[PDB]
Assembly symmetry: C2
Homo-oligomer: 72 residues x 2
Amino acid sequence: FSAVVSVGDWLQAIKMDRYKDNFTAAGYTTLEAVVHMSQDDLARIGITAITHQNKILSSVQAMRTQMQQMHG
Amino acid sequence: FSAVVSVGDWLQAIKMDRYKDNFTAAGYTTLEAVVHMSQDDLARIGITAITHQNKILSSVQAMRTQMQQMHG
């Protein structure tokens, strides 16, 4: 059991679900793996649009900060 | 948007879903709130069976450790 939601749910929530297959094909099936991605990882995955890279990276930053609060 | 699942999902996963209403009635609607509970909070909520208190507390401990790994 995992306390975190699916990558698919996260992508739809940030309107980047057009990239669902991009994450899956590269083995990024859990948010734990996604949260440790870099800009280069996103480019390698097929997300070359800098705007989309930033939306995803900003979201990752917010999810990490949210997870820090999951254990004060 | 929250990256964590519902209290209901967590309770069913640890077979403590008989207590769904106990959490809700006391305002524990998010896992963020649940993760900061103490034994006394569980008793006050109606979970008096020590075995059930421990199953829940042990789960909380595991979810917290899992969330630490959500930002290495």
